[PDB]
Write a structure and sequence with these properties.
heterotetramer, A: alpha+beta, Transferase(Phosphotransferase), domain 1, four-stranded antiparallel β-sheet, three-stranded antiparallel β-sheet, 7 helices, 8% strand, B: 309 residues, Phosphorylase Kinase, domain 1, binds the ligand COc1cc2ncnc(Nc3ccc(Oc4ccccc4)cc3C)c2cc1OC, ATP binding (chains B, D), phosphoprotein (chains B, D), protein serine/threonine kinase activity (chains B, D), tyrosine-protein kinase (chains B, D), membrane (chains B, D)
């Protein structure tokens, strides 16, 4: 019945959609409809008719989700084999490529402000009850600088899991210790709300240290160290008090010990 | 360290290596495939020589490949009787290709899966091949293997035992994003803890391998009380595996079956403490090595009696 | 400073906007941008530089307001003298013109369902803390039938007030007794949340009786009768119990006696 | 009920009424304006007669105007010495226009605002004009005025006192959406309560008007104890006003100043109970009317001595 959704089911008027050049796993196209718009083309897995509640209820719930720190989810339509996600085009670069592009200021004020933008967007998702799961620095755009968040909540169709089992680089250290203990045949993992606040923690580390932890260590090394709760150093100069203390909270071994995004916002607003 | 007949086979490779000025993507007519994790047994047309071409998807910009292939030419001086002599390296569309010396017998991981369990007499000859392979790399090139697996030891029908795929081009390693983990790890406990690793870290991988080669099963976790009783003759998470390597006693060879020399050999390698662990020098003068060094085994004869040719 | 807003301040990509034929106090144009879109053109009152918080804070707060029962507020830009409101075009007719267009079914199920759609849209506005004030039947569209709500919250610029003082017909009986007591020089009236739930009450009357109360009585008659809390009859056949009882709640003389939209929803779901 | 000289002035209107077959929007060359709430003192070109054209914005479909002007022709038989003789009605762009007999003196609301307060002797003559105006409309046309205001009683320099703008076309009334209320209401208490209203409801409006015409101020609420003492010689909400009409005592004429006949006259009209309130018959035989019926007042003389001409 509702095993396929259309663009007419969305609140945004769609009479025509054209596709431009390719700029993107998922193939990201530079589409357009009276305003620059990004378009992702992903072929879903065969069969799985039980993906009613996994799409007719999941991705359709992205309607009525509007925020200034979250990308404008235009909508999506899916034929039984195909799928096309439509979203507002970010008029800038990713936070990933700008935190490694020497040399950006990102002082005490800037870094704190950028972190405050992420938690605000994640806070709106914290209220709507949607887990980002794959919260990386590659899923955040900066320009004005106007910070927005994309590739949120949509797992399974996206990366970065797949008889050896393949794991990404950055996402491996974005995971919370309860989730860094996976086997080879697995989503359906213990993803919580504290899972997302952990991912922000390594992003908060990524902001000050200009990159994510475990910079040289091999995959198996990350799994065990982060699995035993061996949180990386922060006194690599120069942080000190105020800063780095929040890192310990967002990287707590017990998920209950980690603050919520709404609670986290107060810890950032306190200045150094 | 030099052998008369091995001096012949090496310089016979230097001749057919100068037959190719530059490598072309169309010179390699596709024939077959070795495996994936993706190697090809292609056929070079100008030189007229069949070799093992290896390629894996890589989306990089031209500014990166100029420094990837740059550090990829170090393998030229790394020609050894116990190291697979490579030819060259280039770029194709969106994947880097590397052609090495073809080994018509394949890796030991394939051989182990076919023969079931490899005899102790043969493992002795293979053991010496690994030691000199790591020593030659560390003394003359200041480079360690960084990753020793049963699938990284190539063997041909000519009787040669050589190594392959070791860390040398550090620029290429960063390009290999999202890599596979595996249900079977050969990581040393000190690397899992993040501590600095020496060439003795590869020794752990060598010892952990040898146990698997001997029993025909991955050592961790140790077999039951009924499993080992029905293996004589002729569902865990990844983190739990790695944690067992750190805080639990090392694997061990079955008693009675193997000689005490071979039992002691793998135990000197599987010491969880790298400091008290044997080094490349201590292993070279071990009782098992000195005995297996004088052994006379038809290595190519037993090999072709299992996989053919 | 921020005495003027632009379309670029909105989360929806605007590269080009064209205007079609006229279909509309405020001049409503049949505009378009890759999808049929309604455009209102209203010239704001001169001066009033204090309208910063009345627009830079008010109409700009319509961002992050997305709902299936509320029209998609595309955005708006204003020059110091001019103003243009952009909103999604409703692909149908108004509830006003369909409740008087003989003959529509609107039985027990239908009427109850349509009323449930209004309270849901008003409920989302009840959460965001925005008063509709001018909640008429002319501000509701029906097609699929898909019920949506427009012309919400934006007073002053819209009607329907203006030395005799002019009052509309329908809006006069949409007001709650606390608000039906105005003078000649006045917005800035006691508009509450119970003000909106009253307006729905007369709409709920309009659904069953096919029109709003006080059908023949002159303006001054409405002001006094509704002012003294003389709520119109409902036993004009055929209602009875279950129905018409909610009318008494939504038309309570004391505003505190009227249920909230969230509380009201339970009274409708109870069936006859 | 017929007067000799008034029979002349009426039939003199029937002659110049047949001069116009149809009304054209361009036949009326704009000259001046009376007021708004919008009337014009235009000049008809074919007939060559100046008249009072009245038009107000109306956005209607052609299906409605066909039944609006339909019920708007009833005013033809409503020609009376105390009723402004209308000409016709048409449609222009987006507003309906109605031309009536021009009254060069204007409404009484304008006259009252100029002269300040109108003498009792004059109000007597005006009082009789209203009575016959309502009687002629109700007996011969079955139609009441439904709205009596000082601005709805037209007066010319010829001495005529006529009525204007009364409810007759019920189809047009629904078209007049969003209408003005006002700070001064002449509504009868029974209409404010929603109860049925008779022709005696206009009597309340007549009485409430007369009080305002006499003192030069809207009766509700009654003046202070110092205001009325400084008015002899020669900030409330709308709901509070309407509620005062219902639950509070009716307005009253000042004692001593006006004769007891005139005091009693307005009191018989301002009875909050329509049942005990005087009717068109009782008012016709009242002491104030019978006395003012035989009065001799230069109505046009006093008028032109205030507004000119
Ligand atoms: C200018 O460079 C880009 C701007 C983008 N803006 C917005 N979405 C993108 N890509 C993107 C990212 C995620 C995505 O899927 C979503 C899943 C959940 C929620 C929103 C989007 C769909 C798309 C099209 C973008 C990609 C870009 O280049 C890589
Ligand atoms: C097809 O017929 C119509 C569809 C409409 N759809 C959507 N807005 C309209 N008009 C409208 C109604 C209100 C409005 O101003 C708003 C104020 C607050 C929130 C949303 C809109 C702006 C506009 C353009 C429409 C008008 C229509 O004909 C009258």
């Amino acid at each position: 019945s509702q095993t396929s959704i259309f663009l007419q089911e969305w609140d945004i008027p769609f009479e025509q959609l054209e596709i431009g050049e390719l700029i993107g796993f998922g193939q990201v196209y530079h589409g357009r409809w009276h305003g620059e718009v990004a378009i992702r083309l992903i072929d879903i897995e065969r069969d799985n008719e039980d993906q009613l509640k996994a799409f007719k209820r999941e991705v359709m719930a992205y309607r009525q989700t509007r925020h200034e720190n979250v990308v404008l989810f235009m909508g999506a339509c899916m034929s039984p084999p195909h799928l096309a996600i439509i979203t507002s085009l970010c008029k800038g670069r990713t936070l990933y490529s700008v935190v490694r592009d020497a040399k950006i200021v990102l002082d005490v004020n800037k870094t704190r402000q950028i972190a405050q933008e992420i938690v605000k967007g994640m806070g709106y998702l914290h209220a709507k009850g949607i887990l980002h799961k794959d919260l990386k620095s590659k899923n955040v755009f900066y320009d004005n600088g106007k910070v927005v968040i994309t590739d949120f909540g949509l797992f399974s169709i996206s990366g970065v899991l797949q008889d050896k089992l393949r794991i990404q680089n950055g996402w491996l250290c974005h995971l919370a210790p309860e989730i860094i203990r996976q086997l080879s045949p697995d989503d359906k993992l213990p993803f919580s709300k504290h899972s997302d606040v952990f991912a922000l923690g390594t992003i908060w580390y990524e902001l000050h240290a200009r990159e994510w932890p475990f910079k040289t260590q091999p995959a198996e090394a990350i799994i065990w160290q982060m699995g035993t709760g061996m949180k990386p150093n922060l006194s690599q100069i120069g942080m000190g008090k105020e800063i780095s203390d929040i890192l310990l909270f967002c990287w707590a071994f017990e998920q209950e010990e980690r603050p919520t995004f709404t609670k986290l916002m107060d810890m950032l607003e306190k200045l150094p | 360290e030099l052998d008369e007949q091995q001096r012949k086979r090496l310089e016979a490779f230097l001749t057919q290596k100068q037959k190719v000025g530059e490598l072309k993507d169309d010179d390699f007519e596709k024939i077959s495939e070795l495996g994936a994790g993706v190697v090809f047994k292609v056929s070079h047309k100008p030189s007229g020589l069949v070799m093992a071409r290896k390629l894996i998807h890589l989306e990089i910009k031209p500014a990166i490949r100029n420094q990837i292939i740059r550090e990829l030419q170090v393998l030229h001086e790394c020609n050894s009787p116990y190291i697979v002599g490579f030819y060259g390296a280039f770029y194709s569309d969106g994947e880097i290709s590397i052609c090495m010396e073809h080994m018509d017998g394949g890796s030991l991981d394939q051989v182990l899966k076919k023969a079931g369990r490899i005899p102790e007499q043969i493992l002795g000859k293979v053991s010496i091949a690994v030691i000199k392979g790591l020593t030659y790399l560390r003394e003359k090139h200041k480079i360690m293997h960084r990753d020793v697996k049963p699938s990284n030891i190539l063997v041909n029908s000519r009787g040669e035992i050589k190594l392959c795929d070791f860390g040398v081009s550090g620029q290429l390693i960063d390009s290999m994003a999202n890599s596979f983990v595996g249900t079977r790890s050969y990581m040393s406990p000190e690397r899992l803890q993040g501590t600095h690793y020496s060439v003795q870290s590869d020794i752990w991988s060598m010892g952990l391998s040898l146990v698997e080669m001997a029993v025909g099963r991955y050592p961790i976790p140790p077999p039951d009380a009924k499993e080992l009783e029905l293996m004589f003759g002729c569902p865990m998470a990844i983190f739990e595996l790695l944690d067992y390597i750190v805080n639990e006693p090392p694997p061990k060879l079955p008693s009675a079956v193997f000689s005490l020399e071979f039992q002691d050999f793998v135990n000197k390698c599987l010491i969880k403490n790298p400091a008290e662990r044997a080094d490349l020098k201590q292993l070279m003068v071990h009782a098992f090595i000195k005995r297996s060094d004088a052994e006379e085994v038809d290595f190519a004869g037993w090999l072709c009696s299992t996989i053919g040719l």
